Design a binder for this molecule. Sequence first.
Ligand SMILES: COc1ccc(C[C@H](N)C(=O)N[C@H]2[C@@H](O)[C@H](n3cnc4c(N(C)C)ncnc43)O[C@@H]2CO)cc1
Ligand SMILES: COc1ccc(C[C@H](N)C(=O)N[C@H]2[C@@H](O)[C@H](n3cnc4c(N(C)C)ncnc43)O[C@@H]2CO)cc1
Ligand code: NA
Ligand SMILES: [Zn+2]
Length: 866
Amino acid sequence: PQAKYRHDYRAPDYQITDIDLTFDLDAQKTVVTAVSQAVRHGASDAPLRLNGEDLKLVSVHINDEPWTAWKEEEGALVISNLPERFTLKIINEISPAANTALEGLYQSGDALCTQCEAEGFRHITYYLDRPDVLARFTTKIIADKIKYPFLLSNGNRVAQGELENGRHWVQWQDPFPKPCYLFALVAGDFDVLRDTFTTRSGREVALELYVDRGNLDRAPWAMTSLKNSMKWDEERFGLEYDLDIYMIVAVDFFNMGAMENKGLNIFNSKYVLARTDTATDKDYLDIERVIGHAYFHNWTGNRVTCRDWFQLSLKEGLTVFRDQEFSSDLGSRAVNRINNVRTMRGLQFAEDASPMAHPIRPDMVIEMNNFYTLTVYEKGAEVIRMIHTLLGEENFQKGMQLYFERHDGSAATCDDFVQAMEDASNVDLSHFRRWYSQSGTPIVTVKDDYNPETEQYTLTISQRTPATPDQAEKQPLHIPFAIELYDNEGKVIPLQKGGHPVNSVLNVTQAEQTFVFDNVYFQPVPALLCEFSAPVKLEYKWSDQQLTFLMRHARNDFSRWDAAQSLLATYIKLNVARHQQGQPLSLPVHVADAFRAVLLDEKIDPALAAEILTLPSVNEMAELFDIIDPIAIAEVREALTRTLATELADELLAIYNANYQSEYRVEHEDIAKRTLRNACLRFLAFGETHLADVLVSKQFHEANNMTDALAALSAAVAAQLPCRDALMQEYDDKWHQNGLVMDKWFILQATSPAANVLETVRGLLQHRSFTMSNPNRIRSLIGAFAGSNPAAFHAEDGSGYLFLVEMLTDLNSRNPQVASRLIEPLIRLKRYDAKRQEKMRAALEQLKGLENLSGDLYEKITKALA
Ligand SMILES: COc1ccc(C[C@H](N)C(=O)N[C@H]2[C@@H](O)[C@H](n3cnc4c(N(C)C)ncnc43)O[C@@H]2CO)cc1
Ligand SMILES: COc1ccc(C[C@H](N)C(=O)N[C@H]2[C@@H](O)[C@H](n3cnc4c(N(C)C)ncnc43)O[C@@H]2CO)cc1
Ligand code: NA
Ligand SMILES: [Zn+2]
């Protein structure tokens, strides 16, 4: 369609204060009756323009009068000649069973459910579908009681009835005014897990978790995580739940992960269901994080919502920041930080160099569903974490309090939030606001100097952001740049200047500046950008010895990991260059030694050891290069794995056996040891073949949990061990009837290093457990192939591109949101070599030419070809 621009925001000409919905539900034809109380604020001659998509209009009344002064345009009902106050009644029809895009009211198996964020409510009825219009909802649902015994919407059940012909109804009322993107409705038959939580101040909240019949056994962990979320929001932010009931529904057909609809969250069943033998540690920790996320939105999203969709990061940056803090408080703070930083440097940095690059507050949008992004979410959270770094926790909490005090019950902007932090804290964030408007990854370059005469250490720090496809003009940011200086014994040198302490978070606000530290009694080794204090690329000329020194002595665990990443980065680059010339891996002995030391150090948290022994993904590796050679990166990852496996064989085996655990528990210390153990297993799989096959075949068959079974099956696929096909067949035979469990298997198929992997993936389009109608299946087979198997996707013959093209040709008509996610690997063509660009550009040109090209794909394809 048309592009929308943030600078065109204007307050609406009309407001709706209250809406009274009735749904006469049927999967083929639902009848919606919508009675809205409305108020004109604009001019007497400005019509009311209601958004609407794929609605059949049955009638329109204004204060009970059949209205003649209206028309239908593309995506709208435009109503003229209105009074200043009136009751709008719309009756319209929709078809949930036809809805394959999973936006609006649609069917997930036998259940009916909604997804309204961002602009989905307009697929349900004609409305002011924009988030600065907030209204009190009342929702009456009528349905067949055999098919739809449970009828749910936001808030409290206020009314109930039985009708003739085996139909019944229920009515719901939510007292908190809300934007329509927070409306939900669910109808179906469910098992329900019921529990309670008592808030800090004494309010008893009924908790209800609705899952498909037969899954009540995969529900307790989710329930436990919801309670943990409620408690933690109380402890850390002082925020209590505000209603009497908290509902969560797990559905199998869902485009997002989870939707924070007020009092009635709707979740991808992936981020709900877990059993010891179906779900890994990471699934558990994911379920905790996503449950937390949806819950944290209750304040950062719902009680304070977004003025317009360009303000998405107001709620997402802040709510991701909150789910990261929650995971970090409850588990390992370092491991959380490490994985969030992996995602930043490996996926988000790629997005900010791509044709889809955008600031965390976008300036232009064609299809808003395209902006539910790594940038908006993860970079968003980094921006919030930077405010925290600048203010400290006490001031940050005061800013949170001021934000709620001012904006509770209304829609706000990114700028309102920054303003609350600034006013509450008395820290100036004027310059800081430039993080919201500027796209791309800044590059921070650092040079140092030690003067022994004066005992001064000088840092010369410079920054630039390169131009991005969306912005030609770039300016310097306010970069909180955290340092520590270590002496020759590993002790922290105190930071000072002119005889007074200096804060260790430097305000790097200029294109270039110099910081001078005094009483630096010994030439330091620095930890730069501590805890990834700003989302930037660091350019510093490290020696290997500086890096291994940091691995042994750095105070913060994250710095030890990060030092190690910098150590490996030099050698990854070296060996990618070697690969291109036909040369085998080269690696200095002392690099191997550094990793041996981590394996055998008995004092190191095993959580941390595991992360140091987890090599950068092919995605983190790709960001070290201007032009990406995806085949060299994959082969080098495998070769570096083989070489460390050979060098460290005896140490790896010892640590593998030492961390054996007979009991399975979902507890942070046990997860650490298991994670280290399975990191050792993965190297061992790439070692001596027989021993590998034995270890892996055995762990798979003996495992009492899916973490251990999958780590092994995954190693078997990756090293191409002899046991592979047999373990993979066993897994399929046992688990084919279970889609979430099979997703792991499809990911393994899709990411296999085998030579015929595409041929297998095509074949798996026919597999019993695959369906093009399910986003989860699609993402696990097709999406994993294109995103996570770059060597096969980028096969020289272009076969990966054409496969994706076929898939997208289907998905563009079926589910454009999923299509748009799957296209993302093809729009990175400018990172690749000429011959690859040529073939990727042709693929995009083929897709550009589809009849009924979705706006979702259109936005991306044209940016990519520009
Ligand atoms: C939706 O719910 C979740 C669930 C879990 C997480 C945390 C987890 N480390 C994690 O999955 N983290 C990551 C990623 O694994 C994955 N991801 C997001 N975008 C891509 C991508 N591009 C082609 C865009 N390729 C491969 N994987 C991608 O989604 C997460 C974004 O942080 C985040 C969000
Ligand atoms: C083949 O290529 C593919 C295939 C699939 C994807 C989807 C990817 N998991 C993904 O980006 N998915 C996500 C993320 O980028 C972000 N997001 C959504 N929810 C969260 C979340 N909490 C729920 C914890 N935390 C962090 N980020 C989140 O919004 C997106 C849409 O819901 C991407 C690329
Ligand atoms: Na009017
Ligand atoms: Zn969210």
